[PDB]
Design an enzyme around this catalytic site. Structure first.
Site, PDB file in Angstrom:
ATOM      1  CB  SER A 153     -14.760 -11.248  -0.538  1.00  0.00           C
ATOM      2  OG  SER A 153     -14.609  -9.855  -0.763  1.00  0.00           O
ATOM      3  CD  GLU A 189     -52.964  42.631  -0.447  1.00  0.00           C
ATOM      4  OE1 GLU A 189     -52.866  42.617  -1.694  1.00  0.00           O
ATOM      5  OE2 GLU A 189     -51.992  42.443   0.312  1.00  0.00           O
TER       6      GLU A 189
END
Length: 707
Positions: free
Chosen positions: A418, A168
């Site tokens: 644990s 353009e």
């Protein structure tokens, strides 16, 4: 007759006036705020420097993680090039908050494992530290619903400017010639003030409005605005606008470094980025990428380029979990005045290479894991923080991370099993004229008075008891023994063990000081676990976990700066001993599986298991980070896993998906490596086991040499 004049003027004037009117907002919008720019979200900035222990390969992995591209011979920023003992790179230009920087050409030279040299190929000179730019992770949701990354005019490569024009063409300041329609130019005006839909209310207003713009504005800037407005795809309910972001989005490259083949594609999509959306229907998208390329001049080749156009695979909402933390830590540390701010630059603590190693460890790890044990489902959460600073490197919150809705790294509380054991041993070893590594603990049938009918009869994993009836502090943890643990924690006092937890940094309203706690009656979220082990890894310094490093305004004003805020929670000598013990855990003891694959990282680690393994764990400490790995089912059904070996093989993966720094453990003052005998009494010379005792003098040795 006449009238064509007294109307001509009565037709004039009203053009103006209204003209002047829509000549005022067109000004009084472009001048000040032109948009509502979202916050850029950036990761870590690495700072290279001589004698850094980063390998060449490590560095390569780094650069690619940070958007750089391995090339045959350089040509622009974002590129590097690998030799035998060096990398040459064009360190792309980034707006650092200590000093905006421009592109730099540097050869990083490596000697064995460590980067040895970083030199400017301009002045053939050395740097002392050399900065690395951050990766753009994402852009905090635009309340306007319109996401942009704004780069000034200069930030646009000439060709790109050109190839945009070549569809353009920029005219003069009007329009004219271009309107050879047989049945336009700058249309910035269109999607900046005008709505919908078709003409003639539109085009009319558009053009008039256009030549107003073009006129009382610069034939340049028009394209600074333009190249930041055009639409190029979606990422949910957010729009994607401007070229600067499109590049990242589709090609993961600064808009400044687009190969013209891609560079022209983005130009093409401008006609309708939804029907061009390169993933959804590529075939079509490729053609438009050609009508552009295929265009007269410039100059030689429509052939080379026309071969393939990558465009990586999409991002809707990258890093959903870590972002959750950030999002959170913001709200806390600022308040609300922010989501109403434009062009802010959030600099986080996120580590690209870590997130990948981990995400890869999960998505690959768990399915592979389900395969061997079957298991109709399984899940994980991973957390990597900085050993010393507590800065959060990576955060996985699910088996499928780029797919997250639920975040197990942050919002899934679970029994730590644990994994609780060290808090006890640490609480004891912080004496240390009472409990040492060589201190004997009873290994005998426990039965505790439960203040509510029952009577607690804990037991060992194998239920046995040492024929000795006792076992040393070391081993008890090394093997993660229950009976001798309860035995110890109980002799220490629950209240005692309880405050160590408080000091390591876990939520206060989680400690309930019944005995179970000792063996892991404690429900934390991995993020919090991370925090605890952090505090021990750091030498005993509680650095609060942190996602943020800074947060800068459009201008350059810091809005928040995260400063070091570590705190002394437990004695160094104690922390040391716990770790050195955990090193045992990983080679001699429970985590022995890992000491085997990486005997040279000398990791310190603790193994995490629960009743029937409904919650598996592993906490890992290399030279530079803490890495908490959780594996368990969303429904708490038991995993069928072989204990902490589930979480351990995810970690193992992550461990290999990247390159860990080894844990070389410098001891605090007052740490002596003494020898004990077989009965575990200290001895002057010799010994058959050597253990790190914490003492200001081995006349300890000579006391042990009689009594």
């Amino acid at each position: 007759l006449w009238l064509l004049l007294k109307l001509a003027i009565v037709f004039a004037v009203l053009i103006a006036i209204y003209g002047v009117y829509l000549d005022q907002k067109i000004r009084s919008r472009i001048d000040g705020k032109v948009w509502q720019l979202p916050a850029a979200v950036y990761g870590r900035m690495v700072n290279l420097e001589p004698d850094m222990t980063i390998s060449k390969n490590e560095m390569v992995k780094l650069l690619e993680a940070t958007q750089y591209r391995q090339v045959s011979k350089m040509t622009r920023p974002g590129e590097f090039t690998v030799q035998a003992n060096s990398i040459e790179m064009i360190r792309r230009p980034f707006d650092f908050p200590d000093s905006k920087e421009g592109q730099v050409r540097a050869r990083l030279t490596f000697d064995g494992d460590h980067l040895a040299t970083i030199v400017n190929m301009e002045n053939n000179r050395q740097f002392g530290f050399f900065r690395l730019d951050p990766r753009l992770i994402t852009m905090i949701s635009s309340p306007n619903g319109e996401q942009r990354l704004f780069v000034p005019r200069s930030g646009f490569p000439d060709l790109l400017v050109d190839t945009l024009l070549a569809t353009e063409d920029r005219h003069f300041y009007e329009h004219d010639g271009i309107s050879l329609y047989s049945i336009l130019t700058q249309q910035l005006v269109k999607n900046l003030f005008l709505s919908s839909e078709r003409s003639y209310w539109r085009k009319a207003n558009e053009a008039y409005m256009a030549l107003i713009m073009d006129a009382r504005y610069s034939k340049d800037r028009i394209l600074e605005l333009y190249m930041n407005e055009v639409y190029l795809g979606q990422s949910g309910d957010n729009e994607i606008r401007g070229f600067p972001l499109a590049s990242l989005y589709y090609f993961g490259r600064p808009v400044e470094e687009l190969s013209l083949d891609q560079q022209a594609l983005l130009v093409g999509m401008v006609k309708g980025a939804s029907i061009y959306n390169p993933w959804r229907n590529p075939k079509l998208a490729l053609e438009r990428r050609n009508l552009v390329l295929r265009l007269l001049q410039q100059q030689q080749i429509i052939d080379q380029e026309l071969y393939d156009m990558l465009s990586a695979r999409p991002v809707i909402s990258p890093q959903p979990a870590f972002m959750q933390l950030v999002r959170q830590e913001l709200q806390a540390k600022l308040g609300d005045k922010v989501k109403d701010l434009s062009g802010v630059k959030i600099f986080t603590t996120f580590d690209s290479v870590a997130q990948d190693a981990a995400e890869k460890a999960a998505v690959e790890g768990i399915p592979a894991l389900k395969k061997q044990r079957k298991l109709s489902d399984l899940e994980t959460a991973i957390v990597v923080v900085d050993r010393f600073s507590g800065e959060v490197r990576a955060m996985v919150g699910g088996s499928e991370p780029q797919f997250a809705g639920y975040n197990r790294a942050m919002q899934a509380r679970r029994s730590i099993g644990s994994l609780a054991k060290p808090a006890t041993y640490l609480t004891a070893l912080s004496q240390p004229k009472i409990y040492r590594l060589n201190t004997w603990i009873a290994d005998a049938p426990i039965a505790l008075r439960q203040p509510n009918g029952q009577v607690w009869s804990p037991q060992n994993d194998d239920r046995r008891y040492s024929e000795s009836g006792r076992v040393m502090l070391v081993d008890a943890l090394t093997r993660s023994m229950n009976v001798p643990t309860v035995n110890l924690g109980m002799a220490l006092g629950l209240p005692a063990v309880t405050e160590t937890w408080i000091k390591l940094g876990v939520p206060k309203d989680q400690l309930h000081p019944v005995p179970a706690m000792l063996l892991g009656a404690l429900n934390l979220t991995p993020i919090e676990v991370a925090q605890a082990f952090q505090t021990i890894a750091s030498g005993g310094n509680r650095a609060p976990l942190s996602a943020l490093r800074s947060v800068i305004a459009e201008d350059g004003k810091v809005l928040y700066q995260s400063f070091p805020q570590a705190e002394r929670a437990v004695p160094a000598q104690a922390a040391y001993l716990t770790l050195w013990t955990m090193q045992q855990v990983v080679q001699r003891g429970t985590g022995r599986q890992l000491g085997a694959k990486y005997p040279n990282l000398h990791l310190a680690g603790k193994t995490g298991t629960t009743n029937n393994n409904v919650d598996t764990w592993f906490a890992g400490i290399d030279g530079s980070t803490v890495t908490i790995t959780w594996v368990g089912r969303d429904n708490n059904q038991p995993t069928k896993l072989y204990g902490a070996s589930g979480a351990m093989s995810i970690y193992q993966r992550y461990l290999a998906n990247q390159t860990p720094t080894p844990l070389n453990l410098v001891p605090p003052e007052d740490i002596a490596d003494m020898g004990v005998d077989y009965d575990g009494n200290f001895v002057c010379s010799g010994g058959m086991r050597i253990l790190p005792v914490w003492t200001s003098d081995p006349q300890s040795l000579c006391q042990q040499s009689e009594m």
